[PDB]
Amino acid sequence: AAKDVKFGNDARVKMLRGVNVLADAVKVTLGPKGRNVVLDKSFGAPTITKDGVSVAREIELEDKFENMGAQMVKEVASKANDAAGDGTTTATVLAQAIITEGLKAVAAGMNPMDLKRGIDKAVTAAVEELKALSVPCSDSKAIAQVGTISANSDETVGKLIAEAMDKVGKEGVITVEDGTGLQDELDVVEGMQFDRGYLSPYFINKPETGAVELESPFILLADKKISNIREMLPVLEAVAKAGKPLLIIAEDVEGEALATLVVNTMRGIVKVAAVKAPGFGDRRKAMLQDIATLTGGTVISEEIGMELEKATLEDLGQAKRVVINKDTTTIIDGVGEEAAIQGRVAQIRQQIEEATSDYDREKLQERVAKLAGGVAVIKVGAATEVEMKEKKARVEDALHATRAAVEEGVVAGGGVALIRVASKLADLRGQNEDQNVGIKVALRAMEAPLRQIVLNCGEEPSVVANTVKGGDGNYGYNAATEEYGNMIDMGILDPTKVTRSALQYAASVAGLMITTECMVTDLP
Amino acid sequence: AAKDVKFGNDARVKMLRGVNVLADAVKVTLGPKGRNVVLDKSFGAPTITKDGVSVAREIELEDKFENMGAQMVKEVASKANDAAGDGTTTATVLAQAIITEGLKAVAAGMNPMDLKRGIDKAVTAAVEELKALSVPCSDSKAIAQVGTISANSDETVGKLIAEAMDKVGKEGVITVEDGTGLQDELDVVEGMQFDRGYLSPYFINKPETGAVELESPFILLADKKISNIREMLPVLEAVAKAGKPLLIIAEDVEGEALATLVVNTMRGIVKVAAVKAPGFGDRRKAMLQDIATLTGGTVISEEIGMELEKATLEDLGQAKRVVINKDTTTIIDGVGEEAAIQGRVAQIRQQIEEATSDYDREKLQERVAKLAGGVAVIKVGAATEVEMKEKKARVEDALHATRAAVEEGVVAGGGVALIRVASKLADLRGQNEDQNVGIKVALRAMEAPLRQIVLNCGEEPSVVANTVKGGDGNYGYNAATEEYGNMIDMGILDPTKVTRSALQYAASVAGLMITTECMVTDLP
Amino acid sequence: GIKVALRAMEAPLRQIVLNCGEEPSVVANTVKGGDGNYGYNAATEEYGNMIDMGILDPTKVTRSALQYAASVAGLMITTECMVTDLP
Amino acid sequence: TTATVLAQAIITEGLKAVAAGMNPMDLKRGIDKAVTAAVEELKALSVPCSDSKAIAQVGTISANSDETVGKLIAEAMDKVGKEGVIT
Ligand SMILES: Nc1ncnc2c1ncn2[C@@H]1O[C@H](COP(=O)(O)OP(=O)(O)O)[C@@H](O)[C@H]1O
Numbered sequence A, B: 001a002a003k004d005v006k007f008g009n010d011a012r013v014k015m016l017r018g019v020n021v022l023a024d025a026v027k028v029t030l031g032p033k034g035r036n037v038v039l040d041k042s043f044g045a046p047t048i049t050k051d052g053v054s055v056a057r058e059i060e061l062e063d064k065f066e067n068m069g070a071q072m073v074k075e076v077a078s079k080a081n082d083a084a085g086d087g088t089t090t091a092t093v094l095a096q097a098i099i100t101e102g103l104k105a106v107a108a109g110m111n112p113m114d115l116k117r118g119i120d121k122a123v124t125a126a127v128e129e130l131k132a133l134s135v136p137c138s139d140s141k142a143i144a145q146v147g148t149i150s151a152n153s154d155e156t157v158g159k160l161i162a163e164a165m166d167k168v169g170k171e172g173v174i175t176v177e178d179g180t181g182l183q184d185e186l187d188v189v190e191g192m193q194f195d196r197g198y199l200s201p202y203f204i205n206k207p208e209t210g211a212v213e214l215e216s217p218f219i220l221l222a223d224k225k226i227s228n229i230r231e232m233l234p235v236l237e238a239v240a241k242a243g244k245p246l247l248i249i250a251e252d253v254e255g256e257a258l259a260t261l262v263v264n265t266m267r268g269i270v271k272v273a274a275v276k277a278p279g280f281g282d283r284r285k286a287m288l289q290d291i292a293t294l295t296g297g298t299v300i301s302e303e304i305g306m307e308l309e310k311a312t313l314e315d316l317g318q319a320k321r322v323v324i325n326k327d328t329t330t331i332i333d334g335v336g337e338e339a340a341i342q343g344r345v346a347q348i349r350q351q352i353e354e355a356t357s358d359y360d361r362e363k364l365q366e367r368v369a370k371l372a373g374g375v376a377v378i379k380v381g382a383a384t385e386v387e388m389k390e391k392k393a394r395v396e397d398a399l400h401a402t403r404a405a406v407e408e409g410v411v412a413g414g415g416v417a418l419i420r421v422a423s424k425l426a427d428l429r430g431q432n433e434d435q436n437v438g439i440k441v442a443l444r445a446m447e448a449p450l451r452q453i454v455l456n457c458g459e460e461p462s463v464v465a466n467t468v469k470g471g472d473g474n475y476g477y478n479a480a481t482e483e484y485g486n487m488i489d490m491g492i493l494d495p496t497k498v499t500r501s502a503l504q505y506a507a508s509v510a511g512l513m514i515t516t517e518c519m520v521t522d523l524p
Numbered sequence C: 001g002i003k004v005a006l007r008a009m010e011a012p013l014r015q016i017v018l019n020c021g022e023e024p025s026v027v028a029n030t031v032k033g034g035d036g037n038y039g040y041n042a043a044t045e046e047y048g049n050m051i052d053m054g055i056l057d058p059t060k061v062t063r064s065a066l067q068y069a070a071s072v073a074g075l076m077i078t079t080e081c082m083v084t085d086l087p
Numbered sequence D: 001t002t003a004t005v006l007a008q009a010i011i012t013e014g015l016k017a018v019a020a021g022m023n024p025m026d027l028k029r030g031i032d033k034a035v036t037a038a039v040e041e042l043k044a045l046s047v048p049c050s051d052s053k054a055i056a057q058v059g060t061i062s063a064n065s066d067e068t069v070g071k072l073i074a075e076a077m078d079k080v081g082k083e084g085v086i087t
């Protein structure tokens, strides 16, 4: 294909125009005051959205070069959401400010490489300062309002989340279930979870979040990389007698064909899934038979001693519910029985004494807590099930935030945290002035999220930013109530996890943007 | 896809042009004098319509941005019809007036957010005042002319509706049936209804209102979310022996495939339907076996104790007629027999004493009245059945209005009600003047429906609006007879239900329109 | 109308501060909060008594600027129609 | 330059008020009422200048802060006297 080659300022000017168009649309929707963006939908009334992610995914530009600049910022903003579940608009507000000023400095003939180093040095220092700024919210009492604040300042969703982590503070998995009673129901089931993606991108089922809630499927568990269609078809034939969905847990399938192919064949037919087992080698294999002991299943392949093909519905695990997604496999409640599952407890307690490897010891002491801790199951018993269905997303909204908050503590929400780092590290100086200019570009960019939010509020951003900069600690503007106060006390706070991720991702995209010598795109 | 990005006044000016084009066409058809709009039809003479809904659905604009502005007003006008069955043109007359003036205020640099708050504050106050304005029409004597007025001022259709609600005043379901006698026939059959939509949008049958009148089908009733094509095909084979249509009542089907698919497969073949059971959990399940007791059927699935597949035509409910639509399931007369149906009456009377939950008590006392109240069946015995078929739509016309009227009472029809709220709340003032301007924009907009109607009448709107504003209570212009009088006495009135819905929906679309910072549409 | 004139009178200070690069509104608030000749020395980017710092403007020039601006501006706001040669 | 900046602000604020539906002529009368009062207050604020130190300072500020220009004009101011003309 013919490729259009662009160079120097020619390419950079095109890239900035694309960054600006995407940032402008995402920036208006920052904070409680974010103005709605009308997104054309192909049939039906155009969607009106106050959410940055929907607008960003929508934005595509017709200029090949301008689109490439927009796409690069979008992927880093999405990466911020992957690390912590929000920060998508904040990442683009920060990225646009660093990128626009940095590109202008490069257009002044300044060395791009140390401009990049100076911005990165300031970012690393700011990240350490943010951790110092952090308020540990480990205690359940802190979790109680942290969770209420986390759920878009809603007490009802927050308290249920807080009630369960009252159950497990930290690592206990908590899941959201539609309530079967009009009173809310919470129980802890000693099920399981592991952070392993599904073996095709296309396994998505009914919940609009790329995920696979699955009611009473049976589970295959395999100890060699499975020979595919010839011996999986017997099992699929057996599975299709009963009518239940199947999940493959394995090393992989012999996957170049059928791990790609099976989800394109089987969605409309039967619904069948596949996932990687956790860790590698003996740990993966041992962990698969740990998984087996907990589900009630046994592990199966031609290779070791326990042939696959003629397997029945008894020769499987089963779980009352399963969740599976791009990045996670979750077992909500096995068919396995208390005594058999506790065939494990004697060994796992024993090996913790003595294991000759430090990470084997760590894995064993992680595994026993995990195995016994289980999954906290929250049933949202709202009077209206459509409304608990609606609040169900906010509850998933909340635990993403609450989990991030417990992991890194909390910072003064509002860009007050970035203002105090900016004021805190004004002293930091670059070795050369290209480096010095880079430090300043990063510091000025840190002010941009607070200023954009006050602009959406209609307050002129400068008076407020001057007052917030002048103020002490968590003194900040609550734009929803339009007055200054202590933000943490007022109830505006976010995890140090979220702010740190947005700043780091914004810095990386900006550095690449400043140092991009040439852009090659397909000819229009 | 390449997306055209618009910003600030650039987008708003495009959106206003689209709102204006749609509003202009809908506004001319307001009231008895509404001038006809010729709607091109692809083959045959162009339809001439004095109905706003037909014109609004028709209007589509070629500019991507202009169409998006029109579509947003259309969906809110349709939402007004969904809440109460009319108000579609009135919503657009009100929406255009708030949107045009509000956009002009935003174009004056005024803060969009409080303009929005000021309009909304005035609307909330006006809604309370409208309820104070309300005349309770609960009494059957009030229903008698309320119904006559409701049926486009026709006494014949109104009296039959009034005669049946003489039967049940309020909650008793009343249905319209083609008369089998030349004398009108009215009977009350203790059948059933529940406000649950059908499980595909495409289930539509013979009546031109998206609905499913169905003569003697048999009914499936299921107590688990059904395993689909493999065990539904036996039943479908059994059903297709007899030749009757089938309805699935269930939690759902295992629906991602066959609940979407079945209506695309089975329309031309056999005609088969599916609906959600009412409520959730024990209440849904109990209510399904309440439904079972009343129809004469029993509830069926693999899961609890009563396998599906080999079921006969006896192992079903049956009803003489059924109605099903986007939002409702109706059972007109079971096959069930008096004594068996009254297997229920002892329990339902008993549990009302003692139930330990307040909403369980409410559901029980709602359920007994509902179960015994039944469906009032009106047979329109006109001398001409084509004419009773024609009047049949007006009778459906009437009960939509009569039901709304009994629920909220009635207000001086004619925009006289909105004039008196506007005059009543002239005192209301915004905290800031952006808020003050918003209150005034809402108040001036309230006058627009009366003025548009007098303009269609050919009276200049100002003299009449000045006189109506000056006059007392229900003093208003009867544009059909072209003279002022007491509107309620003259026979021009509408439910508080209808006016309140139109004002609320118009305010919501206007606020979004004023605060829309950016519009993203697919490139032309 | 009186308010429009008073708000406009703050405009020269804001524009000098904008040319300096400091935030005009923040400086305007400090000067408005201050009293007497307290003002922002644009060259030294500091706040001090203007007479003491030597920043003095002739009264005739300031008075003339206000009167001339008000007369032309007041007529311009009243314009409702413009008639000009077709391009 | 200051007259243009003041005029631009009065027109921008006035046009926004006319857009709100405020009668344009009434705003013009209000602007004029404020200006007449402001001119009197400038006369009260004014303190006379004839010190050659002050004469140099008004010259320096008027010359984009050129100290030499103000210094020389004060001396020429001094030598010619009030009836004198400086070119
Ligand atoms: N009531 C408020 N007062 C001040 N700012 C707020 C308030 N609530 C949230 N914020 C801040 O505004 C941002 C939330 O805006 P949001 O629309 O969710 O964009 P994003 O997805 O990038 O976080 C966060 O930075 C949050 O800290």
Ligand SMILES: Nc1ncnc2c1ncn2[C@@H]1O[C@H](COP(=O)(O)OP(=O)(O)O)[C@@H](O)[C@H]1O
Residues within 6 Å of the ligand: B029, B030, B031, B032, B034, B050, B052, B086, B087, B088, B089, B090, B091, B413, B414, B415, B449, B453, B477, B478, B479, B480, B481, B492, B493, B494
């Ligand atoms: N005889 C009449 N006198 C005055 N106005 C009337 C008369 N009859 C109805 N109206 C008013 O005119 C409106 C009915 O117009 P219509 O064409 O049905 O549009 P819409 O569907 O929005 O109600 C209602 O607001 C009604 O109150």
Ligand SMILES: Nc1ncnc2c1ncn2[C@H]1O[C@H](COP(=O)(O)OP(=O)(O)O)[C@@H](O)[C@H]1O
Residues within 6 Å of the ligand: C012, C016, C040, C041, C042, C043, C044, C055, C056, C057, D001, D002, D003, D061, D062, D064, D065
């Ligand atoms: N350091 C200073 N502080 C503030 N303003 C200054 C300073 N020095 C000179 N000025 C000038 O700024 C304005 C001068 O305007 P100028 O640009 O010289 O053109 P003109 O006098 O025709 O309006 C005056 O307010 C004057 O005070």
Ligand SMILES: [Mg+2]
Residues within 6 Å of the ligand: A086, A087, A088
């Ligand atoms: Mg957010």
Ligand SMILES: [Mg+2]
Residues within 6 Å of the ligand: B086, B087, B088
């Ligand atoms: Mg109508």
